[PDB]
Amino acid sequence: GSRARVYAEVNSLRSREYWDYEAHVPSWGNQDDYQLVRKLGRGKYSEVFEAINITNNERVVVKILKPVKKKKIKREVKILENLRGGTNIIKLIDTVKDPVSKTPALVFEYINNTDFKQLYQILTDFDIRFYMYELLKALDYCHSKGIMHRDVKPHNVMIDHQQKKLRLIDWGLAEFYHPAQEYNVRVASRYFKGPELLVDYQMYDYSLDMWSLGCMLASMIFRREPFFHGQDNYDQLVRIAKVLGTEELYGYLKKYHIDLDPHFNDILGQHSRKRWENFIHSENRHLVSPEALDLLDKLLRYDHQQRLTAKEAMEHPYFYPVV
Amino acid sequence: GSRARVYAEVNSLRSREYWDYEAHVPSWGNQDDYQLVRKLGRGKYSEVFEAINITNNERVVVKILKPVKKKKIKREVKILENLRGGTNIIKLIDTVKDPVSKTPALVFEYINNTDFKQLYQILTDFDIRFYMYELLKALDYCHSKGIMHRDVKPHNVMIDHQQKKLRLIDWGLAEFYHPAQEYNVRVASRYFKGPELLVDYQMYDYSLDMWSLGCMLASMIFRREPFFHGQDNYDQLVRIAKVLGTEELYGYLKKYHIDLDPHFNDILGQHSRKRWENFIHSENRHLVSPEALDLLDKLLRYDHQQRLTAKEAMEHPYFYPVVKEQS
Ligand SMILES: Nc1nc2c(ncn2[C@@H]2O[C@H](COP(=O)(O)OP(=O)(O)NP(=O)(O)O)[C@@H](O)[C@H]2O)c(=O)[nH]1
Numbered sequence: 198g199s200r201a202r203v204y205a206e207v208n209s210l211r212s213r214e215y216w217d218y219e220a221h222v223p224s225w226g227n228q229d230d231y232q233l234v235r236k237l238g239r240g241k242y243s244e245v246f247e248a249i250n251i252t253n254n255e256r257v258v259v260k261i262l263k264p265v266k267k268k269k270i271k272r273e274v275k276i277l278e279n280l281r282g283g284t285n286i287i288k289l290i291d292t293v294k295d296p297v298s299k300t301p302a303l304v305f306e307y308i309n310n311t312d313f314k315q316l317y318q319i320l321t322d323f324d325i326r327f328y329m330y331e332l333l334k335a336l337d338y339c340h341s342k343g344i345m346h347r348d349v350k351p352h353n354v355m356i357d358h359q360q361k362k363l364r365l366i367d368w369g370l371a372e373f374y375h376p377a378q379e380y381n382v383r384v385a386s387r388y389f390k391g392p393e394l395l396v397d398y399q400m401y402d403y404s405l406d407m408w409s410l411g412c413m414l415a416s417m418i419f420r421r422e423p424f425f426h427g428q429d430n431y432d433q434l435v436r437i438a439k440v441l442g443t444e445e446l447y448g449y450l451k452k453y454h455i456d457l458d459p460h461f462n463d464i465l466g467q468h469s470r471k472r473w474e475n476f477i478h479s480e481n482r483h484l485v486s487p488e489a490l491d492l493l494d495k496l497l498r499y500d501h502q503q504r505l506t507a508k509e510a511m512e513h514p515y516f517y518p519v520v
Numbered sequence: 521g522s523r524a525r526v527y528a529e530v531n532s533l534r535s536r537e538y539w540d541y542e543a544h545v546p547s548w549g550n551q552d553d554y555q556l557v558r559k560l561g562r563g564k565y566s567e568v569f570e571a572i573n574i575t576n577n578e579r580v581v582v583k584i585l586k587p588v589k590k591k592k593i594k595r596e597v598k599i600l601e602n603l604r605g606g607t608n609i610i611k612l613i614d615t616v617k618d619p620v621s622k623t624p625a626l627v628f629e630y631i632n633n634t635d636f637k638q639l640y641q642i643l644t645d646f647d648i649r650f651y652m653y654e655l656l657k658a659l660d661y662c663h664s665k666g667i668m669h670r671d672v673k674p675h676n677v678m679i680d681h682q683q684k685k686l687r688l689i690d691w692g693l694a695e696f697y698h699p700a701q702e703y704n705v706r707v708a709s710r711y712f713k714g715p716e717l718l719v720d721y722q723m724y725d726y727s728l729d730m731w732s733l734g735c736m737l738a739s740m741i742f743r744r745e746p747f748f749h750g751q752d753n754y755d756q757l758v759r760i761a762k763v764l765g766t767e768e769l770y771g772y773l774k775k776y777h778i779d780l781d782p783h784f785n786d787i788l789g790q791h792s793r794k795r796w797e798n799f800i801h802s803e804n805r806h807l808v809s810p811e812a813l814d815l816l817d818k819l820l821r822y823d824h825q826q827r828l829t830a831k832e833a834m835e836h837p838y839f840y841p842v843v844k845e846q847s
Pocket residue numbers: 237238239240241242243244245258260306307308309310348352353355366367368369
């Protein structure tokens with residue numbers, strides 16, 4: 198088995214109503230209070246609009262939830278309510294339904310995001326440190342609140358680059374951490390899935406988010422986006438092993454008594470561990486530093502229990518200029 | 521427009537007589553060489569008998585072609601001849617007739633089939649992997665020979681479960697693929713019709729057969745047979761949309777400039793894309809694996825161009841247990 202090194206017991210120390218989301222009962226308002234002005238984006242679970250609340254003329258975001266089970270809606274809503282006011286966590290403002298279709302929708306505060314494909318190519322070293330530190334504040338907060346995000350990726354991190362403002366959004370895959378609990382491995386986007394998910398290890402914890410955050414750090418400093426570009430869920434593990442090494446993979450499997458599906462033995466091959474300096478070239482040298490590589494090496498580890506916690510990462514020398 | 525991602529130009533690179541089935545000229549022998557031991561079944565243009573060839577004692581199957589337009593007889597014969605020797609394709613032994621009645625018939629190798637209704641209730645995980653891989657060999661072969669089967673379904677897959685033998689049979693609807701050609705959407709059997717057929721998209725290709733093979737895989741691992749059980753061609757699409765989702769369907773229609781029959785507006789509704797894990801329960805858990813669902817997800821897709829090819833499917837980890845034992 199395995200347990201989180203930090204915040205393991207926090208949910209058991211809280212009232213049951215805090216984490217018993219199935220018992221939560223949203224109050225569904227009328228979406229006709231909201232004028233849908235502009236399509237801001239979309240995801241696997243919703244279409245997202247810039248909206249105006251017609252009663253107070255406040256600009257907001259309305260995420261219309263594609264059909265889905267009520268237990269999943271209760272989970273996302275309760276998590277958002279528990280995290281309301283947390284540093285750099287998107288604020289849930291309202292839960293509404295269209296009066297005719299009855300389709301549910303979540304109303305959030307509005308952030309003027311710059312699309313990451315365009316933003317990431319103009320970031321400086323200092324900018325990357327700044328935004329990674331802001332994202333870490335959000336993750337340490339939710340982890341301290343007993344919640345794993347489970348879908349950390351650039352599309353779920355909103356950044357207003359002119360106001361230096363960041364919000365971690367899209368808590369639809371988030372889940373409460375309880376020690377010993379076995380979780381669904383079908384979470385996160387392929388490129389950001391931790392090795393624990395790709396080898397079907399279900400007793401994971403907040404450290405899954407730190408893998409995803411290291412994936413983002415690597416893409417930002419090295420400019421290879423996504424950094425681990427698997428062609429499918431099996432090749433995803435291969436892409437990781439070609440960097441971290443195969444002997445190190447087997448050591449992790451052995452430690453947690455994980456049986457790797459036999460099909461993997463051929464496609465994995467044998468790969469030495471690579472020095473992170475190997476990914477530096479003329480197009481990214483001005484974003485890479487020894488301190489960035491040290492932090493990266495301590496996040497992208499097979500063993501989830503040895504990865505830095507969010508708070509440990511925040512104390513790393515890479516962030517001294519932004520503390 | 522649309523084109524097959526593989527084997528698109530193959531027929532143009534062959535002699536015209538390869539695909540110009542209209543000009544094919546069969547050689548019709550005497551059916552008196554074959555004794556008829558038992559009628560096994562019958563289709564729309566057929567009457568099928570387990571038989572023995574008197575000149576060599578070999579057991580065979582005699583399919584008496586009912587009177588159809590001669591052009592469609594030449595198509596099936598010419599396709600069967602081109603696929604002779606192909607892996608897991610039923611072998612055409614001869615083309616025979618009666619001296620005075622002129623009724624044509626085809627002679628095939630015999631297969632001691634177990635009806636899929638009994639068989640599928642006793643297959644193991646490895647057995648499904650094994651038989652689906654053998655069928656993929658037949659589909660990759662025929663696709664590589666420029667041919668779409670267009671009627672893949674359990675009834676046209678013969679499995680000898682004792683000698684572990686599989687043959688893809690009934691080629692009367694198969695056609696030759698030529699890029700840009702628009703084909704009749706009235707092919708396949710309702711439960712195995714790809715979305716392209718149900719929405720009248722005629723510029724389809726070999727990927728049609730891959731939809732049909734995903735339908736078979738789904739029914740074998742989940743034990744919901746047929747997996748998509750429509751009561752007619754309209755409801756067939758509704759059954760698919762209840763699984764793959766409606767916004768996914770409209771994106772596909774929008775990509776290929778497909779406009780729906782107005783009747784669909786009242787029956788399709790709104791459905792989210794379902795996770796394949798939703799279909800697992802205690803009666804099929806022993807046949808489902810993460811690898812099985814990964815492969816299924818990549819076969820049952822609206823966009824025919826995005827489905828895996830036969831060769832791609834053969835490389836999937838779901839078949840790793842099958843590829844290594846055959847080595
Ligand atoms: N400009 C702006 N865009 C937003 C805001 N919130 C969400 N979006 C856009 O709409 C996208 C979808 O929002 P999200 O909460 O992730 O919905 P989802 O269906 O859960 N997406 P996923 O597939 O990742 O699960 C986001 O990636 C983003 O581009 C916002 O506050 N401001």
